[PDB]
RNA sequence: UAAGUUAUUAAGGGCGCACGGUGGAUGCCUUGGCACUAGAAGCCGAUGAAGGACGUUACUAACGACGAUAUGCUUUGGG
C-alpha cells in the first residue's frame, strides 16, 4: 500500500540503520551482514514507490 | 785469515692458470603495438552535453564500476 509502504521505510530500516551505524562506531556491534541487507531494503521500497507513482 | 768465480732473499711488480664478486649483454618467451582486407556505421546537447570535482564497502591509499535507491535497485529472457 502507498502509506504502508512509507511507514515502513521512513520509521523502519532507517531509525534501524541508525542504531546499527551509531552501535558499530562506540565498538559494541557485531552482525555487520546486518547493515548491507537493511540498506538495500529501501533500495526496493523507494523502487516500487517510484514506479507505481 | 790470499786471488778469482757464481748463487738464495721479493717490501712490491709481471705472465699463465684455478675459484669467487659487481654488472645486466646474449638466447628463448608475450598481457602490448604497427600496416591492412570485408561489413556495419558516421554525431551528442537547455528533457542539461563532451570532460571533471567530491562521494559510495564490515575495516579501504589507489585502479575499475556505481551516485544519498551510491562496490547498486526492478522487470523481461538466457544459464
Given at each position: ?11 523502519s ?21 546486518r ?14 514507490a517510484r514506479?507505481?507513482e
Amino acid at each position: 500500500l502507498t502509506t504502508s509502504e512509507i511507514e515502513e521505510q521512513i520509521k523502519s530500516s532507517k531509525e534501524e540503520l541508525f542504531n546499527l551505524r551509531f552501535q558499530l562506531a562506540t565498538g559494541q556491534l557485531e552482525e555487520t551482514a546486518r547493515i548491507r541487507t537493511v540498506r538495500k531494503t529501501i533500495a526496493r521500497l523507494k523502487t516500487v514507490a517510484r514506479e507505481r507513482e
